């Protein structure tokens, strides 16, 4: 659920209420998509800004914490299963590689040092706050003494976390942790999760998904090095083209210059974008498919050129200057 701040008495907007136990939310502004984690169903899902486009990016046995790096297009998360892992992948979940798997019992409060490209997290059982490189080569324990530190956030040169025992919010220097002070008094209840509201410019990065859904017939996820198309989890889908268009995923998709449309039927890539409907689906000549004029040197924009024929490029279609 969400509540608008400047909305007076706001009632929590009920979205994705079907999930069971779950304690993870992250919203990517770049693509305006939520990354609600369905721990009960053991799957990390992505949702639209209103929650319409539901897609399961990845499935994790015990997913609790979620970190987004839209500029780098990588989805960071942690698994509460045995031998707890900081599993990292793209926004499309291309490479689910556990960043850190040793010396971790119950990871929580994953945070990302965007300015310094570092990974910070806490562990309630370990009662320590550690930092690591995005790959995980380095590993430094920023805070050694803590009491059930559960939440975490980072901003400026300070790192903020919450304690379930003392029921208060602390602060420490992100580099070392020298200034461990208490930011609040003994709160009546236990503070679960702490986040930073970056009213100022956040991690802005041009969204590849902006241009015609990033060349995707379906949901788009702006991962590293260009957009990464996504497909609905409810249906069985296979990405077409260079992993771009979700199909019925029944197989028998023609390759080479006979790209298969979104329906599954394939037509020649030369036949594609012929100002007609080669497939039962317009995918053959779909907009995204025919996004820009990058005509091959071979073809004019001369087989039927200027020869009273409307089978060549439209510029030379029946425009025969020789006649």
């Amino acid at each position: 659920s969400y509540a608008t701040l400047s909305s007076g008495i706001h009632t929590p907007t009920v979205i994705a209420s079907g999930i069971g136990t779950a304690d993870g939310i992250a919203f990517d502004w770049i693509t305006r998509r939520i990354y609600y984690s369905d721990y009960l169903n053991q799957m990390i899902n992505s949702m639209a800004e209103d929650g319409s486009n539901r897609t399961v990016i990845a499935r994790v046995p015990k997913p609790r914490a979620i970190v987004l790096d839209p500029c780098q297009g990588y989805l960071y998360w942690a698994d509460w299963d045995t031998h707890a892992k900081i599993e990292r992948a793209t926004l499309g979940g291309n490479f689910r590689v556990p960043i850190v798997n040793s010396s971790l019992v119950m990871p929580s409060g994953l945070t990302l040092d965007y300015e310094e490209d570092l990974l910070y997290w806490v562990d309630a059982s370990l009662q320590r706050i550690e930092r690591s490189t995005l790959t995980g080569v380095d590993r430094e324990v920023i805070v050694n003494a803590a009491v059930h530190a559960f939440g975490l956030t980072l901003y400026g040169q300070y790192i903020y976390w919450t304690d379930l025992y003392t029921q208060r919010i602390y602060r420490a220097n992100k580099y070392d942790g020298s200034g461990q002070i208490a930011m609040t008094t003994n709160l009546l209840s236990q503070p679960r999760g702490i986040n930073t509201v970056v009213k100022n410019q956040k991690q802005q990065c041009n969204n590849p998904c902006e241009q015609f859904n990033g060349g995707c017939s379906h949901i788009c996820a702006p991962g590293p090095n260009g957009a990464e198309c996504q497909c609905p989890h409810e249906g069985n889908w296979y990405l077409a083209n260079n992993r771009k268009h979700c199909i019925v995923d029944n197989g028998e998709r023609c390759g080479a210059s006979s790209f298969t449309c979104s329906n599954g039927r394939c037509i020649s890539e030369e036949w594609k974008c012929d100002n007609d409907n080669d497939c039962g689906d317009g995918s053959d000549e779909m907009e995204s498919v025919c996004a820009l004029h990058t005509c091959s040197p071979t073809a004019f924009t001369y087989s039927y050129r200027c020869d009273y024929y409307n089978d060549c490029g439209d510029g030379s279609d029946e425009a025969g200057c020789l006649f």
């Binding site: 040197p297 071979t298 004019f300 001369y302 087989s303 020789l322």
Partner: protein, 315 residues
């Protein structure tokens, strides 16, 4: 047409008559190497290594015009696409193949960074450029007219490939190897590699020419224009003898230079390409530009690229 150190002459194919049909092209000093013809203009193209320049001259000797002077040291062959009026030559010293648009003497370097190219030939209808590199491991290579796709069609059992001849009637590339003393022919894809019967005294053949059912060739050690049947060989007949440093044997025929192509379209001269038609297989064209220019957003026109292609200083 046979090119020799002393001069370049054209003998009739009939054995009875032995009178030059073209004005012999001679000079002092001269090391003529490489020849080509233009049936429509009744003009020949030849390279003189002594003068380090490529010239053109009509068969009657009316006009002798310089074709290229700069960046020319050792031109060893000439390929002329009659459809696009483009002349291709191999400069061994620069180890590169260059194409000149004869309509305006616009110059462009296509296939380049080679080892020791010796001959070249351009097939307009098939849109293929065949050239020979005798540098061991010697290889017979093919590429598109613009030099796009370089492909070693033949790279096995080649010692010294010297001359290439295109049998336009049967669409087979006949070549000559001086190391193994063999005349072999394969498809344009180099599939059907059949070797002719052993030539009687062939030791260092250099030239070749396919006319009718006979396959003329030149041998340095013999110093003669030996004729054999293109079928299997035999019938060794010395057309001429005693030539000093006999070399290429480029042939002449009106029927060879005829027909349509990707170019030669009434309102698409060179396929509406600014400089180069460069016909490529499957009856298509790729526009080309000189060294100083490049293809624009629309590939039809040519635009200068000083940022990537600074002007070439003369010397």
């Amino acid at each position: 047409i046979f090119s020799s150190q002393v001069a370049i002459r054209g003998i009739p194919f009939t054995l009875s008559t032995q009178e030059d049909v073209m004005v012999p092209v001679s000079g002092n000093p001269s090391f003529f190497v490489g020849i080509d013809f233009d049936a429509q203009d009744s003009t020949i193209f030849f390279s003189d290594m002594s003068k380090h320049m490529i010239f053109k001259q009509k068969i009657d000797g009316t006009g002798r015009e310089i074709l290229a002077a700069n960046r020319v040291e050792n031109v060893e062959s000439l390929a002329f696409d009659w459809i696009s009026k483009n002349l291709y030559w191999t400069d061994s010293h620069y180890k590169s193949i260059s194409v000149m648009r004869l309509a305006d003497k616009t110059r462009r370097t296509v296939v380049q960074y080679l080892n020791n190219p010796r001959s070249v030939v351009v097939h307009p209808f098939a849109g293929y450029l065949f050239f020979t590199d005798w540098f061991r491991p010697a290889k017979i290579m093919r590429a598109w007219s613009d030099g796009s796709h370089l492909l070693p069609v033949i790279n096995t059992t080649l010692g010294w490939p010297n001359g290439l001849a295109i049998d336009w009637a049967a669409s087979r590339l006949y070549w000559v190897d001086a190391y193994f003393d063999k005349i072999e022919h394969s498809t344009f894809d180099g599939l059907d590699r059949r070797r002719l019967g052993h030539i009687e005294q062939m030791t260092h053949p250099f030239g070749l020419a396919i006319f009718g059912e006979h396959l003329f060739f030149t041998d340095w050690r013999l110093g003669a224009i030996i004729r054999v049947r293109k079928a299997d060989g035999g019938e060794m007949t010395v057309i001429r003898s005693g030539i000093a440093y006999i070399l290429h044997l480029k042939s002449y025929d009106v029927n060879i230079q005829t027909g349509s192509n990707a170019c030669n379209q009434p309102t698409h001269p060179n396929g509406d390409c600014s400089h180069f038609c460069f016909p490529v297989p499957n009856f298509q064209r790729v526009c080309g530009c000189p060294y100083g220019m490049r293809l624009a957003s629309n590939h039809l026109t040519c635009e200068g690229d000083p940022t990537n292609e600074p002007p070439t200083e003369q010397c």
